[PDB]
Design a binder for this molecule. Sequence first.
Ligand SMILES: [Mg+2]
Ligand SMILES: [Mg+2]
Ligand SMILES: [Zn+2]
Ligand SMILES: [Zn+2]
Lengths: 116, 49, 184, 77, 107, 242, 107, 162, 50
Amino acid sequence: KAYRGGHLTIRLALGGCTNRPFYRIVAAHNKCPRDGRFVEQLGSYDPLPNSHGEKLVALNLDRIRHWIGCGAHLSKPMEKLLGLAGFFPLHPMMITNAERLRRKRAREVLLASQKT
Amino acid sequence: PYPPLLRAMIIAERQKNGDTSTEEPMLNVQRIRMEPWDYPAKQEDKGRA
Amino acid sequence: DEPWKYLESEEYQERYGSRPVWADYRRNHKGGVPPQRTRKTCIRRNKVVGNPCPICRDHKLHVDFRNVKLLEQFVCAHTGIIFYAPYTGVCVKQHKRLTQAIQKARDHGLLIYHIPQVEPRDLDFSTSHGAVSATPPAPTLVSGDPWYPWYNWKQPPERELSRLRRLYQGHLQEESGPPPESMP
Amino acid sequence: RKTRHDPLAKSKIERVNMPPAVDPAEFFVLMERYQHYRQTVRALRMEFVSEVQRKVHEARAGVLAERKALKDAAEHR
Amino acid sequence: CRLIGIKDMYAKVSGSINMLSLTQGLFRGLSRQETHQQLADKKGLHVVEIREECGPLPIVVASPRGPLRKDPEPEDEVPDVKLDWEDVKTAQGMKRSVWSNLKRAAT
Amino acid sequence: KPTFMDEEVQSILTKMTGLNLQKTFKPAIQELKPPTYKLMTQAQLEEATRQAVEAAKVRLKMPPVLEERVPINDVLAEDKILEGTETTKYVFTDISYSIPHRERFIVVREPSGTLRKASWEERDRMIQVYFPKEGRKILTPIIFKEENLRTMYSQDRHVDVLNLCFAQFEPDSTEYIKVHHKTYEDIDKRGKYDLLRSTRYFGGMVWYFVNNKKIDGLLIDQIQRDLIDDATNLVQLYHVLH
Amino acid sequence: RSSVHARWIVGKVIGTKMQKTAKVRVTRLVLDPYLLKYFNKRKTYFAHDALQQCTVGDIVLLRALPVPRAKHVKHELAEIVFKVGKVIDPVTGKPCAGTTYLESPLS
Amino acid sequence: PMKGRFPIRRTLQYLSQGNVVFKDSVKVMTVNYNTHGELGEGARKFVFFNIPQIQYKNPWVQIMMFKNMTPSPFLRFYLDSGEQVLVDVETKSNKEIMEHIRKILGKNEETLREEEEEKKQLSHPANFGPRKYCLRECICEVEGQVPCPSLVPLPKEMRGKY
Amino acid sequence: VRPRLIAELARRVRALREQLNRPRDSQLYAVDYETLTRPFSGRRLPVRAW
RNA sequence: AUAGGUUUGGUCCUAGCCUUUCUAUUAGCUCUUAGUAAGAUUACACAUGCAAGCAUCCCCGUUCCAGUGAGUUCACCCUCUAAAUC
Ligand SMILES: [Mg+2]
Ligand SMILES: [Mg+2]
Ligand SMILES: [Zn+2]
Ligand SMILES: [Zn+2]
């Protein structure tokens, strides 16, 4: 299909039922639907933690690189995933979130101390 | 420095090829400039309502 | 219960003989070719309806990973295939159970099945590649320092802060310097 | 989704979209992170592009490929 | 088949289905099939079966009671056998009738 | 001096093992189709036999012995800022159809924001999950428990067990090795070494025995049947080893 | 190199009734997938012919033109591969009829 | 029974069996062959049996048949370069001719193997789809993970019932 | 193949209109200062520029 | 189709109709719970509410997503080249 110059994107996609989210990381057109067609499917990601606490992620890094070269952008979740992997740097947003969490924890601790 | 995994991969590749090479892999932002966000664009390229 | 004894016994011999459990049984149905799946359950509530599925008609016939002979009776000798439900004419639930039992037996090694000699998945058996062996550690790692410098918090110069304040006069929040380095 | 030829809602017109307030120091830090991270990302992208180009070259008029072609020609002859 | 001793096989009955005709025809068919021994006798050679279930291992079924023909069978390629269409279709997967591979009671 | 893939040694091992065409190519309990009957002359028959023998040899060429792999206790990088925020781990695996499965990059992020190169046990499992194989179940199945193994052994069923092991754990694995050793032990005690004589034995039983110095039983077995030359060969091999 | 699909294509000549343009029919073999027999389906093709050298019944081959030089013609008569009647062999290039040499070899 | 003289020509399997896959260069493979001539039997045989197979192998190349244009049977070719291969078939058996063809304008086995490999590469294993293209639809199907609420339902963790 | 002449004509007309009666930007860069909106468009300005 | 029923005083042949199997709609008559998929008949007519904003003003976006199956060989391949993305 012909779109108005919609860029390429490496993006997640819901391949799950209700309450089981399963993800499909996928090189697709920006203006395509979420679960609609794509250019080339890449490494499936699972968010629900499987038997003995693993949250497994596939990645065809070799083809991801190619896609990047060809000029395909990355959604924020994808970027985060990459950072986690060690393929990209940690997305600064993630870092900030972590910091915030830490701060919150500290506050909680302080409150507890006050109480006691 | 490269990000953790890419660098490792590169190292592995190097090893496979043959050379040991203790010189670490690195990327340079001498080429990559950072014109700020408040830097102005161009009215030739924009469309008017 | 704890069966195999029943199979061994004289009663069993009297009843069936050399032939299997299901040879007598015949599904009764509309003419010619029968419905392609068998009835769901022989027994409802505690009742037993119709001519029962060869297992259901007898109390003593149980199904588990230890009734080896019985399980075999519902599998080919020459193929390793578990008979599809309408071959034997067994109950659907019963069939399911039977299959499960067979699987269990296989897992345990209480029932023979072909274990074919595969090739090894990797045709090269070396652990030299970085992949598995060992990468030379990073200088940052050695130091005890993050990958990239900007991962940590640097306190901004005050001028910048002032500028920010000026920019967002009405809309501001009071803030801390750096965060902690732990979180219980 | 609305298609621009529709009127837009009557509750919507009287709605001031007031932005979030800002922590200064934190904001600056965030900005810094964005600056740095993006540079790295750009570099990575460039590298990838270069790799792709190299691959293309290899495919087309890379030396090995050329040699192969020559060999084929010879065989044909 | 049961009466005979024939235990496991496929058979399609086409044309009419007069019972008498079917029975007699069947009987005739069963009478007029060469043994492997018979084949061996006819040809010399060895009737060697090669199973896919077993390995490449050549199992010899029926060797000839007497001499042996040293001239091998001339493998005249693309052999003319006026062959059935239905079988071909089955092999291909062109025909798919809903009444074909139906789960039935034992025999 | 030991060298498993020294050709002479291999030859010797082959010699020690039988062919027994019927045992290599046993009637399998699979989905059968009707056979395909041929009309062979004597020469043709001979040729066929030769081919069969060759096939058998090919089948029985594998496998090697590799020792236990060393566990992977390495770190790519260790971030302290994540600290236990995004909990429950993450397991990132490089995928690529044109890469061998030992040259992969399988990586683990933990709550204590580290980046491990993954355990050996982990890695294989991950590979299986992404590249399924005929055999290889993802969790380690119930057959390789002790009691079950013992039961299997009791039904004089060792070859099958070996095959299963091969299918499951990669030959550098620890568990696999252990299983093999157990099997060998079983074979030794209350002996039936003629179960494994067209397999899966050539290195497995013999080499291991030689290494241990538990050759005596084997020698006895050789004596009892006939196999004097084979026994002599074995002895020679042992001598070479020590 | 060229926009058109058929680049080299052999065919038989029907109509010269139009200036510098031979109408040549081409016949591929097509597999009727039920029968699986290759039946010889056909398709007309105009072709530029500079000199009007070609006559009806000729067997020719047509090179693709870089661009179609009219609505229906996109080919050039590259060579007359068999002239009508006056057919010379590719092997032992001598005048012949059907199945018979006129100027015999050994000359 | 099937209506042909040799009904194995139309079995699909037979077609597949044809070994010759043409090199990329060819465009037209024109055969010319005598009908009543006793010497050119091989050519006739080839026309009868193998031509169909060849076509099946390579459907884009144009195959033309000519009956009595000349005395001696022969095959002539046309490449994208514009050259012309000319193989006289007379005296040979069909098999021999086929072999010759393979040698001349037929691909190697190696090339075929490479092609096959490439094809395989295209259809990946570790990715998920709907059967037709990819093995296994969802990662509930792989063992040791959360197993699709359709079969075994999820615990009270599930939203809206929490 | 049918020709869609009418559509083409319409397009042409639209183009002409754009060329001619286009708003000379006195009109559409205007600002009502008290209400912080705009003539022609009608939409408000963002808060961070008031 | 592993087929069966059915022309006739009967028999054989040829034959159509039907039966038996598996889906999906409605229909009657009935019905405990849980999880999950699927869910106008109709390019007939529509009340009400909502479905596109964002953003230091320009812009960019609302030319996508979602919907329907009215009409219908533009959807696959090559050749060329405009967006449009690095
Ligand atoms: Mg009557
Ligand atoms: Mg319609
Ligand atoms: Zn029941
Ligand atoms: Zn699922």
